């Protein structure tokens, strides 16, 4: 799951490390299993979550 999430998040100009930090800092508590599922077959929702994580970091 971690490898899959990292691959899907590098296309948004983000590491796995930065994305996980932003998700924790934003308050979202979705585990790696559901995030990998979204990365595989709901990429739009994954991009939405990644945008929220980007907002949290800055």
């Amino acid at each position: 799951w971690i490898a899959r999430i990292n691959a899907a998040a590098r296309m948004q100009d983000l590491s796995y490390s930065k994305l996980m930090h932003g998700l924790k800092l934003a308050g979202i508590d979705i585990n790696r299993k559901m995030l990998a599922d979204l990365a595989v077959n709901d990429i739009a929702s994954f991009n939405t979550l990644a945008d929220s994580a980007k907002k949290a970091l800055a």
Partner: protein, 143 residues
């Protein structure tokens, strides 16, 4: 339960051409090995092949920092007594750049049947001309 596992032929495999002018040998090989393995896709399944095909041109201008062009040695043994042979890295870059790149990249792939299948997807040319124009490869930029 419910976790996506890919199937053979289910993922598209594309073609890339990478210019190796001035890049360090290992720093190019790491990126190429990651591309071949298929680790840049959210479809990555460890037990099958989802990676891409790679064409490397201008392998004769690959970079070697320090005194590696003369002080790095490549060894072979024929399994006959006293049959060890040596070769320096600058000599191979001058004469067989393709084999230098192939050794470097092959050392970075998994050492099993799948790794042996992945190695067959790499084409290395010492010049700037390749014969795979029928596959319509794209340009890949490093990093």
């Amino acid at each position: 339960r419910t976790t996506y596992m890919a199937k053979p032929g289910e993922v598209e495999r594309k073609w890339y051409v990478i210019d190796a002018t001035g890049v360090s040998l290992g720093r190019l090989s790491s990126e190429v090995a990651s591309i071949l393995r298929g680790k840049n896709k959210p479809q990555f399944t460890p037990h099958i092949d989802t990676g891409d095909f790679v064409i490397i041109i201008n392998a004769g201008k690959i970079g070697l920092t320090g005194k590696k062009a003369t002080d790095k040695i490549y060894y072979r043994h024929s399994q006959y007594p006293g049959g060890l042979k040596s070769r320096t890295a600058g000599e191979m870059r001058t004469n067989n750049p393709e084999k230098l790149l192939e050794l470097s990249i092959k050392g970075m792939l998994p050492k099993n049947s799948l790794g042996r299948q992945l190695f067959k997807k790499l084409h290395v040319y010492g010049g700037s001309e390749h014969e795979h124009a029928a596959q319509k490869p794209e340009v890949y930029e490093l990093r």
